[PDB]
Each structure stands twice: as structure tokens, then as C-alpha cells.
Amino acid sequence: MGHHHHHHSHMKFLVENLNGSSFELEVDYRDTLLVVKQKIERSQHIPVSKQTLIVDGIVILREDLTVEQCQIVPTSDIQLEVSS
Numbered sequence: 022m023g024h025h026h027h028h029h030s031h032m033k034f035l036v037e038n039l040n041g042s043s044f045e046l047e048v049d050y051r052d053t054l055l056v057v058k059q060k061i062e063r064s065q066h067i068p069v070s071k072q073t074l075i076v077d078g079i080v081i082l083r084e085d086l087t088v089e090q091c092q093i094v095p096t097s098d099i100q101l102e103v104s105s
Contacts (some may be wrong), residue, residue, distance in 0.1 A: 034093065036100035041065045042060045045095075048088055055084035061101070 033045035044064050048057050058069045065072070074081035076099050081091065093099065 028047055031093060032088075034095035034097075034099050036061055036064065036101060037099060038065050038067075038103065040103035041067070041095070041101065050089035051087065052088045054081060054091065058082060065101065067101075067103055067105075073102045073104050075100050 030050040031047055032050070033047045035043055036046050037043045042065070044061075045065070046057065046060055046064065054074075055069075058072050058074070061067075061072055062069050076093060077097050081093070083091070
């Protein structure tokens with residue numbers, strides 16, 4: 022009777038692009054780092070290849086890993102530094 026644990030996979034992490042605009046991108050745990058940056062591309066208007074994901078100091082250069090593996094949460098400092 023009752024009790025249903027509903028998990029929220031939708032994560033809106035603040036894509037804080039210093040050379041652009043901060044945007045909370047709503048990604049799912051299932052989405053890969055390759056796909057998530059394609060979302061960012063249309064948002065920051067910068068090509069995926071120039072999206073230097075800097076989280077807490079670490080650069081995220083992986084397309085093969087999903088966000089559920091990297092566990093990139095909005096409670097970390099997620100910034101973008103536009104490579105010219």
C-alpha cells in the first residue's frame with residue numbers, strides 16, 4: 022500500500038560558459054558525453070570540438086563514456102572555456 026520510490030535522472034547542470042552564457046542543460050543519466058555536447062553546441066553556438074568541459078579542474082575529453090559513468094553532477098563547478 023503506497024510507497025513508490027521515484028528516481029529523478031533529469032539533471033540540469035549549469036553550463037557556465039565564461040565566453041558565452043550560463044545555461045542549465047537538462048540531460049539524462051543515459052545520455053553520453055558525445056550527445057550532451059551536441060546539445061551544448063546549439064546552445065553556446067560553439068562546435069563540439071571546441072567545447073572544453075572543465076569540471077572542478079578536470080578536463081572532460083571523452084565521447085565514449087556516458088554521464089552516468091562520469092557522474093557529472095550540477096553540484097560541481099562546470100565551466101566552459103571557448104577554445105579559439
